[PDB]
A paper describes a structure:
A highly specialized RNA polymerase with an outstanding accuracy is the CCA–adding enzyme (tRNA nucleotidyltransferase) that adds and maintains the triplet sequence C-C-A at the 3′–end of tRNAs. Recently, we could show that the CCA-adding enzyme from Planococcus halocryophilus (PhaCCA), a bacterium from the arctic permafrost growing at –15 °C, is such a cold-adapted enzyme and catalyzes CCA-addition in vitro down to 0 °C. Interestingly, both the N–terminal catalytic core as well as the C-terminal tRNA–binding region are adapted to the cold, indicating that the psychrophilic features are not restricted to a single protein domain, but are distributed over the whole enzyme. Our results reveal that a combination of individual strategies – a global flexibility in the tRNA-binding C-terminus as well as a thermal adaptation in the highly conserved catalytic core motif C controlling interdomain movements during CCA-addition – contribute to the remarkable cold adaptation of this unusual RNA polymerase. The crystal structures reveal a globally conserved scaffold with local adaptations to provide the structural plasticity compatible with catalysis at low temperature.
In order to investigate the structural properties of PhaCCA leading to cold adaptation, crystals of the corresponding recombinant enzyme were grown. The crystallized construct consisted of the P. halocryophilus wild type sequence (377 amino acids) with an N–terminal extension of 43 residues including a 6xHis affinity tag. First crystals of PhaCCA were obtained in the presence of ammonium sulfate as crystallant and diffracted to a maximum resolution of 2.8 Å. They were used as seeds to screen for new conditions and led to crystals with similar cell parameters and symmetry but showing significantly improved diffraction properties (extending to a resolution of 1.8 Å) in the presence of PEG 3350 or diammonium hydrogen phosphate. All crystals showed a high solvent content (67%) with one enzyme monomer in the asymmetric unit. The refined structures are very similar, showing a root mean-square deviation (rmsd) ranging from 0.16 to 0.22 Å (for 370 superimposed Cα positions) when compared to the reference apo structure solved at the highest resolution. Their N–terminal extension is disordered and the first visible residue varied from position −4 to −2 at the end of the extension. The four C-terminal residues (HSHT) are also disordered, as well as the central part of the flexible loop (residues 82–93) in the head domain, except for the complex with CTP where it is clearly visible. PhaCCA is unambiguously monomeric in its crystalline state as well as in solution, as shown by SEC and SAXS analyses.
Numbering used by the authors: -3 to 87, 93 to 373, 378
Write the structure that this text describes.
């Protein structure tokens, strides 16, 4: 935020005092020229990774093989990457000696700018003009950029909504010709880009481009993204886009399971879908489902109830508060432990959640001894 750019300027100054070239590069330059505050600030340098580690007290060496060292300084983290090009196999990183060799194989012209310590902008590919005209355009030959990393095709879509830009005609036609190549991309990278689209502004533009680019033809279950997105308003959670997608089509979670959801995200989607299929919600509904599930289900169905208050006013919040357990029932019934205990604990739990039976051991005992015997 208010400290990342300053810290990167310090990093650059330190790299240059050791005789290396260093520049701000990529998204930070784009954001600076748009008048936004960069979320990430990357530095490109002639220094190799181990030479960066010599110059800074605290570094994180995860991306070393790819040329990247994270520098920890003044409470920020600045990625320092040696000049490099990378290529993706259908199943490779090459360090280079000049900045321009690095820049000419980046994805889009607005991401292929560098800025010096003295605020001079190095813009070999017209990023400044494309930024002013709000155009996402591939650097150089779009066919080549997309053959290098087919995920860039979907990233163009994501950028169009993130920035409210159009996609350059030649670039878009190239995506259409190469959309088949999306099949080689790990579904985790695909899901990460789609999650961004779902929470970004102008997502209806992004979704139209997704279909227009032919990507929906070849994405995993890609045709499912061609719903009417007019009613969609993000709540800041990408999961709500996937739920909105399924709800519009009356489809179930299994239809999108190729994207490898976490067990938590899968549960939120399924339990929310179950809620949208329930005709009436009562105290049991608010007791058994989480508030996040009730809220997401209400959002896709357009309701605007005060869900938190209904849940808050139930007699109890969870099984933890129940005043009896299966061992009480074993005592009172004189029967051996078995699956029957779950049936009868739930009977008692329902009577308590509906406020019929008091949550009190002796009163539950009185009720149980009457109903069981």
């Amino acid at each position: 935020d208010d400290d990342k750019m300053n810290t990167a300027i310090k990093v650059i100054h330190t790299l240059k005092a050791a005789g290396f070239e260093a520049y701000i590069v990529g998204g930070a330059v784009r954001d600076l020229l748009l008048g936004k505050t960069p979320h990430d600030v990357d530095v490109a340098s002639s220094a190799l990774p181990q030479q960066v580690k010599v110059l800074f007290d605290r570094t994180v060496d995860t991306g070393i093989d790819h040329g990247t060292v994270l520098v920890l300084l003044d409470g920020e983290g600045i990625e320092v990457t040696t000049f490099r090009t990378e290529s993706s196999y259908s199943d490779s990183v090459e360090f280079v000696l000049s900045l321009e060799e690095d820049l000419r194989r980046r994805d889009f012209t607005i991401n292929a700018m560098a800025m010096t310590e003295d605020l001079k902008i190095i813009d070999p590919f017209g990023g400044k003009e494309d930024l002013k005209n709000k155009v996402i355009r591939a650097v150089g030959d779009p066919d080549e950029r997309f053959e290098e990393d087919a995920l860039r095709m979907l990233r163009a879509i994501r950028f169009s909504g993130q920035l409210d830009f159009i996609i350059d005609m030649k670039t878009l036609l190239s995506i259409r010709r190469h959309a088949r190549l999306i099949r080689f991309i790990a579904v985790e990278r695909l899901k990460s880009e789609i999650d961004k689209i779902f929470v970004n502004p102008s997502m209806q533009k992004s979704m139209a481009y997704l279909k227009d680019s032919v990507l929906t033809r070849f994405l995993p279950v890609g045709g499912l993204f061609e719903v009417d997105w007019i009613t969609y308003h993000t709540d800041g959670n990408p999961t709500y886009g996937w739920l909105y997608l399924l709800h519009q089509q009356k489809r179930q979670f299994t239809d999108i399971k190729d994207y490898r959801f976490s067990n938590e995200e899968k549960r939120l989607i399924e339990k929310s879908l179950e809620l949208t299929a329930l005709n009436t919600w009562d105290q049991w509904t608010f007791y058994k489902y989480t508030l996040k599930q009730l809220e997401m289900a209400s959002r896709v169905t357009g309701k605007k109830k005060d869900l938190a208050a209904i849940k808050r006013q139930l007699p109890i919040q969870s099984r933890s508060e129940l005043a009896v357990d299966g061992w009480d029932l074993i005592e009172w019934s004189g029967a051996k432990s078995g699956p029957w205990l779950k049936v009868w604990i739930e009977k008692i739990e329902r009577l308590i959640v509906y406020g019929i039976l008091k949550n009190d051991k002796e009163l539950i005992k009185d009720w149980f001894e009457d109903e069981y015997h």
